[PDB]
Design a binder for this molecule. Structure first.
Ligand SMILES: N=C(N)c1ccc(CNC(=O)[C@@H]2CCCN2C(=O)CNC2CCCCCC2)cc1
Ligand SMILES: [Ca+2]
Length: 223
């Protein structure tokens, strides 16, 4: 997260860290046994870390749970990042509490201008690298269809939306991938891609979760 702020410990209680001996992606808890992340975050040996603030210190309230299933959208395309979504099942259910909580799936798609909360342990710099220990937050609006396609012509599918700031300075970045875009209490986006981070005229691109609610429910019920 570039140009954001320290969230505060466990202020984003649905935010998880995906760990493979290091933090490599984010995700969102949607029930005590399932996490929503990005398909480009797939790998084997995923450990899900819930209740995190400082990812480099055991502070209390952490739950480490291995993934027992990682389900990439069958129609995920790694070149276009269309359908950049993955469902991860926990080997055991998480213990739900004020610091470890699920986030609601949306009832409807959000509209342009809608202000959202984007969070992660990703890169905090626009050029060069700096990774934080504690969770970072960014408030960002969803942008219009037209501006999004203007910014990335021929690359925006009906499963992507843009959010952020055309003026540069504030964005998600590498490491934030798979993390939440939450708007009005609902999971509307997944950190997916963009050109660089926080560059002018290149806003973040996010998986449009409202298009997958049925998929998510049908898949979970079947697994
Ligand atoms: N807000 C940001 N600027 C932001 C930027 C990058 C990321 C992490 N995601 C990525 O780095 C992804 C994963 C594989 C290559 N990524 C890309 O960003 C590449 N995107 C492509 C090529 C452009 C035309 C269609 C889209 C596919 C996350 C956030
Ligand atoms: Ca910790």
């Amino acid at each position: 997260i570039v140009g954001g702020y320290t969230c505060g410990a466990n202020t984003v209680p649905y935010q998880v860290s995906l760990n493979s001996g290091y933090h490599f992606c984010g995700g969102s808890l949607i029930n005590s046994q399932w996490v929503v992340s990005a398909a480009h975050c797939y790998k084997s040996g995923i450990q899900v870390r819930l209740g995190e603030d400082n990812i480099n210190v055991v502070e209390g309230n952490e739950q480490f749970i291995s993934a027992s299933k990682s389900i990439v959208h069958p129609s995920y395309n790694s070149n276009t990042l269309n359908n950049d979504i993955m469902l991860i099942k926990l080997k055991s259910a998480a213990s739900l509490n004020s610091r470890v909580a699920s986030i609601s799936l949306p009832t409807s798609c959000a509209s342009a201008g809608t202000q959202c909360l984007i969070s992660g342990w990703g890169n905090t710099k626009s050029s060069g690298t700096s990774y934080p220990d504690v969770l970072k937050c960014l408030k960002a609006p969803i942008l219009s269809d037209s501006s999004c396609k203007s910014a990335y012509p021929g690359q925006i599918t009906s499963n992507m939306f843009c959010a952020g700031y055309l003026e540069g300075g504030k964005d998600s970045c590498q490491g934030d991938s798979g993390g939440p875009v939450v708007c009005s209490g609902k999971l509307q986006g997944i950190v997916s891609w963009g050109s660089g981070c926080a560059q002018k005229n290149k806003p973040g691109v996010y998986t449009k979760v409202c298009n997958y609610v049925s998929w998510i429910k049908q898949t979970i019920a079947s697994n």
